[PDB]
Amino acid sequence: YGAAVVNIDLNRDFFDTATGIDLTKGIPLVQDLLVPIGVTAGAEQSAEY
Amino acid sequence: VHMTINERAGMSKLVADNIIASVIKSNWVVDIHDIEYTAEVMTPSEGYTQHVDAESIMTAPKGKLFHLQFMDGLLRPEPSAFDPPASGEDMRLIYPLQP
Amino acid sequence: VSGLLMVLFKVMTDNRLVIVGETTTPMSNTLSTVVNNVLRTTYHNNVGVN
Amino acid sequence: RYHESVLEIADIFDQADFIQTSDAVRQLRALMPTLSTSQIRHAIERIAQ
Numbered sequence A: 001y002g003a004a005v006v007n008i009d010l011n012r013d014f015f016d017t018a019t020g021i022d023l024t025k026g027i028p029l030v031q032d033l034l035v036p037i038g039v040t041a042g043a044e045q046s047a048e049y
Numbered sequence B: 001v002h003m004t005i006n007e008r009a010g011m012s013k014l015v016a017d018n019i020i021a022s023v024i025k026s027n028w029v030v031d032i033h034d035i036e037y038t039a040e041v042m043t044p045s046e047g048y049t050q051h052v053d054a055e056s057i058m059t060a061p062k063g064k065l066f067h068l069q070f071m072d073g074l075l076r077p078e079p080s081a082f083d084p085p086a087s088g089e090d091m092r093l094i095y096p097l098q099p
Numbered sequence C: 001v002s003g004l005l006m007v008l009f010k011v012m013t014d015n016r017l018v019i020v021g022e023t024t025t026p027m028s029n030t031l032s033t034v035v036n037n038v039l040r041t042t043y044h045n046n047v048g049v050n
Numbered sequence D: 001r002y003h004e005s006v007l008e009i010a011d012i013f014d015q016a017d018f019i020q021t022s023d024a025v026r027q028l029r030a031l032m033p034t035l036s037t038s039q040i041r042h043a044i045e046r047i048a049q
Helices: B015-025 C002-012 C033-038 D024-031 D038-048
Strands: none
Touching: none
């Protein structure tokens, strides 16, 4: 009694960090896939979505 | 001027300090487009933890999704009957432009 | 005059095959629209001035 | 009468063994930045590990 918002999304568990899946923000964010090319990645990228 | 940016790319400061000035003092409704972010509605009781600022929402990069967080604020009881008024309360500079 | 002869001489030599030195393939996400319209796919990490 | 661009979906055929993925894969290709080649191997390589 007294819950503000109750929303649904991807499971934090199934896609555990094991499979690179990381939705600590809300979006399945991967870090090893469409990586850049001849340069370093961007501390944060959309493309990371 | 419902002005809308697109390629918030070249832009510098000066002009960006100017458009923020103008959306505060002259009531313009500017608008970003290429700033894909992720939001998280976080409930009244506490605060807004991660806090941004227009100096940096223009002077931020291009394919980088920054994280903004709006507040639900539908479940925040009322003020007491007997309290010290207010005087000039605040509103809010940025909104999402979808749901 | 001899200066012209030398800047002509280096051009008569040279030589210099070119190999692909450095690749940068950006993300179309990461580029402004104009710099994406000019850019083709890959470039060299030292571009020039144009 | 401004033409209008949508997605066909290969239901013209009416098959079994032919016709496998739906139009979902489409929206998915549309989200990802144009890949080069080393970039396809990079993304594919990351999935291998």
